[PDB]
């Protein structure tokens, strides 16, 4: 807000200086495997397994992502895993997960983050059904500020979905999974993301920019307030078919202000897409749907969260689904050491 737009511009100029110093000088092997006791698996994905861990020497719990180097290789994720780690240690925002330590050994790569105990937003959304517009707006505003922050550092995030958003103690979001995140000034071409959330430009095999994230926010707001994603089917081939068509049907209960904003984000013509216009983010921020949002209070965490998760002591994992436990083997021979030398 004029004075506030200046404060934001000046903020970001300075945060950019901090990001560059860490991006240019990354921290390496800040721990080893044996300082940690592995409690249980908090969640899994196509690539990694995150575990609740305890530091033996300090009694502190963290969340540890484990990637098998032989799998990173077969899945074509070498440069992506290196981006993930390099960006995550250089970033610093209230809504993003904190990377404490990282290290590797003969078999795996390890990233040790702050343990976010409230569960995935996914969990809570599916249990409850759908969120109310004011609840949906509370979270959308956090992601709006996060993207503004990331994009100004020349970063595309690329995997926005309820499964990658976690709920902290205060009921505020922490974005995890930087696996597709990339510092890029021009266009980029990798087919990557999650089916329902893919912008039509990715599907179409076109170069894309930071607008993919804004499309993803349209998909996320729709899913949080309807309780289902705008484009769904049984097979991925059917969702893509739907994405590219461009036809969105809103539930009757969405406000006209909500439908207006989503038509602006779920804009198939990246030219007309909000967040990619001359004004950028201020289009989304000054939308009538966010007229009540005090962007500063949300940034400062001064707003009372609509939902607070309950826990009963540390390592308390009740907010997460249960997963089958795998034993993690470390080979007697170093696997793919050349490809991961900077990690």
């Amino acid at each position: 807000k004029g004075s506030e737009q200046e404060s934001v511009k000046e903020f970001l100029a300075k945060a950019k200086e901090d990001f560059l110093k860490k991006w240019e000088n990354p921290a390496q092997n800040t721990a080893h495997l044996d300082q940690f006791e592995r409690i249980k698996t908090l969640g899994t994905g196509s690539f990694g397994r995150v575990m609740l861990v305890k530091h033996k020497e300090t009694g502190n719990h963290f969340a540890m992502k484990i990637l098998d180097k032989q799998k990173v290789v077969k899945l074509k994720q070498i440069e992506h895993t290196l981006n993930e780690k390099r960006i995550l240690q250089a970033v610093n925002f209230p809504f993003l997960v904190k990377l404490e330590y990282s290290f590797k050994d003969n078999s795996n790569l390890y990233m040790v983050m702050e343990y976010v105990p409230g569960g995935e937003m996914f969990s809570h959304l599916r249990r409850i059904g759908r969120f109310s517009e004011p609840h949906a707006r509370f979270y959308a505003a956090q992601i709006v500020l996060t993207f503004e922050y990331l994009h100004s550092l020349d970063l595309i995030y690329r995997d926005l979905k309820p499964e990658n958003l976690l709920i902290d103690q205060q009921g505020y979001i922490q974005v995890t999974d930087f696996g597709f995140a990339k510092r890029v000034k021009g266009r980029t071409w990798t087919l990557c993301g999650t089916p329902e959330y893919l912008a039509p430009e990715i599907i179409l095999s076109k170069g894309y920019n930071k607008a993919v994230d804004w499309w993803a926010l349209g998909v996320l707001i729709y899913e949080m307030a309807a309780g289902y994603p705008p484009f769904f089917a049984d097979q991925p081939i059917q969702i893509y078919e739907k994405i590219v068509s461009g036809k969105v049907r809103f539930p009757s209960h969405f406000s006209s202000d909500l439908k207006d904003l989503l038509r602006n984000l779920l804009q198939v013509d990246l030219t007309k897409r909000f967040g990619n216009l001359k004004d950028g983010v201020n289009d989304i921020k000054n939308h009538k749907w966010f007229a009540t949002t005090d962007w500063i209070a949300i940034y400062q965490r001064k707003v009372e969260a609509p939902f607070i998760p309950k826990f009963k002591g540390p390592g308390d994992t009740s907010n997460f689904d249960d997963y089958e436990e795998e034993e993690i083997r470390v080979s007697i021979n170093e696997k793919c050491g050349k490809e991961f030398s900077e990690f």
């Binding site: 899945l75 499964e163 597709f180 689904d321």
Partner: peptide, 20 residues
Amino acid sequence: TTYADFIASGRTGRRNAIHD
């Protein structure tokens, strides 16, 4: 209802990233 068709679908569980 659309909620009904979605709840009966194949993709109502945690959705993993594309890799293939």
